[PDB]
From Swiss-Prot:
Function: Cadherins are calcium-dependent cell adhesion proteins. They preferentially interact with themselves in a homophilic manner in connecting cells. CDH23 is required for establishing and/or maintaining the proper organization of the stereocilia bundle of hair cells in the cochlea and the vestibule during late embryonic/early postnatal development. It is part of the functional network formed by USH1C, USH1G, CDH23 and MYO7A that mediates mechanotransduction in cochlear hair cells. Required for normal hearing.
Domains: entry comment: Three calcium ions are usually bound at the interface of each cadherin domain and rigidify the connections, imparting a strong curvature to the full-length ectodomain.
Organism, scientific name: Mus musculus
Tissue expression summary: In adult animals relatively high levels of expression are found in testis, skeletal muscle, heart, eye and thymus, and lower expression in kidney, lung and brain. Found in the sensory hair cells of the inner ear.
Parts forming coiled coils: none
Interval of the full protein contained in this chain: 2288 to 2604 of 3354
Organism superkingdom: Eukaryota
Residues carrying sugar: N70, N82, N291
UniProt name for this protein: Cadherin-23
Limits of the Cadherin domain: 10-115, 116-222, 223-317
Subunit and interaction comment: Interacts with USH1C and USH1G. antiparallel heterodimer with PCDH15. Isoform C1: Interacts with CAMSAP3; leading to inhibit CAMSAP3 ability to induce microtubule bundle formation.
């Protein structure tokens, strides 16, 4: 006439830690009760009750208190597997005892940081100030504690960009120049579990495009400061003299050039504003000598100019 008692004697409840992902059949906890009596009166049958939540645990067999994994548990869904163990003798009116079990699920680092976008992109002007934040990348991590802390890095900022390891803010580290490099495709990395060994850290990367927009910061240039040419005396107006060509490193209208003439010979010559072709406006006589100023002006606002000099001598036929 003794009721089964759980061991150790007077135990209020059982508890054990269980790693999430424990495979089915894995022993989660083993409990035991005793009944001093003889035969069926002292033969103990174990059952489980009130599985909260259900589906994750079962007794290996009803003859013992070994509890094994059924479905695998996910810490991201379940923090506690609670249930009751009933230990019943097999007597005529049976006597039984019941006790709670609390299995404490333990997080493992089974989720990677995952970026909130498939890629990132911004456009910035080439004169953007050093230190300016361009964009923020964000990843999220479904684990807990250190396993969900994220450290951002750039695989290679090229000395032009830097990322804040906490915020994911990508900033200008040194001055840009569209003319040197007009866009960047950077790899940003999110790595969890800071401070642990490389093998227990998970990561993902994403590509970040920064397109560098033009400012009109390059003036038109000629190849040298002095050109020289000759025109025959007594040639008609419209006679070709020379074609002038300047360069400009900017983009679009910022490097679209128009030519003009300046100074004491402008009236005797003309330059086609688009082609750079210089022609005479009249016949020249052999004594005449001109040092013209040729100007190339870009289409920026305000425009930039560059000049060169053009010596024109008139030769006898
Ligand atoms: N040093 C200045 C000007 C740089 C710049 O814009 N240079 C132009 C010409 S105006 C260029 O062609 N840069 C290309 C290079 O240096 O390779 C800056 O850093 O802003
Ligand atoms: Ca008994
Ligand atoms: Ca999990
Ligand atoms: Ca993680
Ligand atoms: Ca986890
Ligand atoms: Ca530039
Ligand atoms: Ca320009
Ligand atoms: Ca430019
Ligand atoms: Cl900008
Ligand atoms: Cl910081
Ligand atoms: Cl680009």
């Amino acid at each position: 006439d003794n009721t089964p008692q759980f061991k150790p004697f007077g135990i209020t409840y059982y508890t054990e830690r269980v790693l999430e992902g424990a495979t089915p059949g894995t022993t989660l906890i083993a409990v035991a009760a005793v009944d001093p009596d003889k035969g069926l009166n002292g033969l103990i049958t174990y059952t489980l009750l009130d599985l909260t939540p259900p589906g994750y645990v079962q007794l290996e067999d009803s003859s013992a208190g070994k509890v094994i994994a059924n479905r695998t548990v996910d810490y991201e869904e379940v923090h506690w597997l609670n249930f009751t163990v009933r230990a019943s003798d097999n007597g005529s009116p049976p006597r039984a005892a019941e006790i709670p079990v609390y299995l404490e699920i333990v997080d493992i680092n089974d989720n990677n940081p995952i970026f909130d976008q498939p890629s990132y992109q911004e456009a910035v002007f080439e004169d953007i100030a050093v230190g300016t934040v361009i964009l923020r990348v964000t990843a999220t991590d479904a684990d807990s504690g250190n396993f969900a802390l994220i450290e951002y890095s750039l695989v290679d900022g090229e000395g032009k960009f830097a990322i804040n390891p906490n915020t994911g803010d990508i900033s200008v580290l040194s001055s840009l120049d569209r003319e040197k490099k007009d866009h960047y495709i950077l790899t940003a990395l999110a790595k969890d579990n800071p401070g642990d060994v490389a093998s227990n850290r998970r990561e993902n990367s994403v590509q970040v495009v920064i397109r560098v927009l033009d400012v009109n910061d390059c003036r038109p240039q000629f190849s040298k400061p002095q050109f020289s040419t000759s025109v025959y005396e007594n040639e008609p107006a419209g006679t070709s003299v020379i074609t002038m060509l300047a360069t400009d490193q900017d983009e679009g209208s910022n490097s679209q050039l128009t030519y003009s003439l300046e100074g004491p010979g402008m009236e005797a010559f003309s330059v086609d504003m688009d082609s750079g072709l210089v022609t005479t406006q009249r016949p020249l006589q052999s004594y005449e000598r001109f040092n013209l100023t040729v100007v190339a002006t870009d289409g920026g606002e305000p425009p930039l100019w560059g000049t060169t000099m053009l010596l024109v001598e008139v030769i006898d036929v």
